[PDB]
Amino acid sequence: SYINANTIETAKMIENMTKEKVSNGGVGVDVELITSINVENDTFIERNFTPQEIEYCSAQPSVQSSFAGTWSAKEAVFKSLGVALKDIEIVRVNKNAPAVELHGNAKKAAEEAGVTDVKVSISHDDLQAVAVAVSTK
């Protein structure tokens, strides 16, 4: 009743983010309120999101929750690098860990920063999407 799936996912994300689990790496945390993303605003969505992210997000039950997820995931990855978010791309298969892929400026800005790998966890519900990105050198 009191501890729903979202609380368990976000707890696990903070537990794995703690120093003793993963330390010596760029850690970015980003949260986005889902109400702060207009999906009808095609100028923002097409500016910041790849066509395969939009295809995945639009297929989900709450489009606005899954857009905020992916948005928080981009902003988390960008904070982990610490240097246009569409460059950062999140592939997300259902009940499978999303993977991060840097294409243009982000890939080159990761090469100067000596960033080998970038992983991300994402939890989203009717209020807030939380994302935690860990970058191994």
Partner: protein, 48 residues
């Protein structure tokens, strides 16, 4: 929209501080602490 950004900031600042709180909690009760305190932060975001 201005206030919803300030609430987003406030949630990062509580979720980053809940890491430092959970560091001192020994690693067997850490899950139970994070569960009770994440749920509280969700409520206080939703309220704001």
């Amino acid at each position: 929209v201005t206030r919803e950004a300030q609430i987003k900031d406030w949630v990062e600042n509580e979720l980053e501080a809940l890491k430092l709180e959970a560091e001192e909690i020994p690693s067997e009760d850490q899950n139970e602490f994070l569960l009770e305190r994440t749920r509280e932060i969700h409520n206080e975001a939703e309220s704001q």
